[PDB]
A = this chain, B = another copy of it.
Amino acid sequence: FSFIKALQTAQQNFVVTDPSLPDNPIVYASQGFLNLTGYSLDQILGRNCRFLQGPETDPKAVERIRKAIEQGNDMSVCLLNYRVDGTTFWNQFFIAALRDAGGNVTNFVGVQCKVSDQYAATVTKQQEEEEE
């Protein structure tokens, strides 16, 4: 199944990046990503998604995503991300590596879900208890 078509239909917040390009930049973003983050598309295309990060983002959470990308692994993390206006929100984030029939990573899709503080407390706790 097209996971992307599934996300389009469900009108989710997601982006697709191209690892064949230096620094793995956004080459597609849904309307949902734009509404959520406040960015317009010319602000987002061709950029690494790390702009979503800021001073209050947990760097160990970011490392999980980094490893997942190095391994062509699917993963999820709850971390804090930044809107175009500098304000934060909690992101239940998911990333998938898409592979061809030959097994080679061809793209990444990242899905963003806004969650409450209460939600984040629970998930971040198990993340910190994982880190310790």
A residues sitting closer than 8 Å to B (CB atoms) are 1, 6-7, 9-12, 71-77, 92, 94, 96-97, 99, 101-104, 115-116, 118-123, 126-127, 130
Q: Which residues of B contact A122 (CB under 8 A)?
A: 99, 102-104
Q: Once the chains bind, are A76 and B102 in contact (CB under 8 Å)? A: no
Given that A10-B6, A75-B75, A76-B74 are known contacts, is A123 also in contact with B103, CB under 8 Å in the complex? yes
- In the assembled complex, the Cα of A11 lies from the Cα of B7 at a distance in Å of 16
- In the assembled complex, the Cα of A92 lies from the Cα of B99 at a distance in Å of 10
- In the assembled complex, the Cα of A104 lies from the Cα of B101 at a distance in Å of 36
Q: Which residues of B contact A104 (CB under 8 A)?
A: 122
- In the assembled complex, the Cα of A73 lies from the Cα of B131 at a distance in Å of 14
The residue in chain B whose Cβ has the minimal distance to the Cβ of A117 is B103
Looking at A1, A11, A115, the one whose CB has the most chain B CB atoms below 10 A away is: A1
Looking at A10, A12, A74, the one whose CB has the most chain B CB atoms below 10 A away is: A74
Q: Once the chains bind, are A116 and B101 in contact (CB under 8 Å)? A: yes
The residue in chain B whose Cβ has the minimal distance to the Cβ of A94 is B74
Known: A74-B74, A102-B119, A103-B121. 15 other contacts (CB 8 A): A1-B6, A1-B10, A1-B12, A6-B6, A71-B126, A71-B127, A72-B126, A73-B76, A73-B77, A76-B97, A99-B119, A99-B123, A101-B115, A103-B118, A103-B122
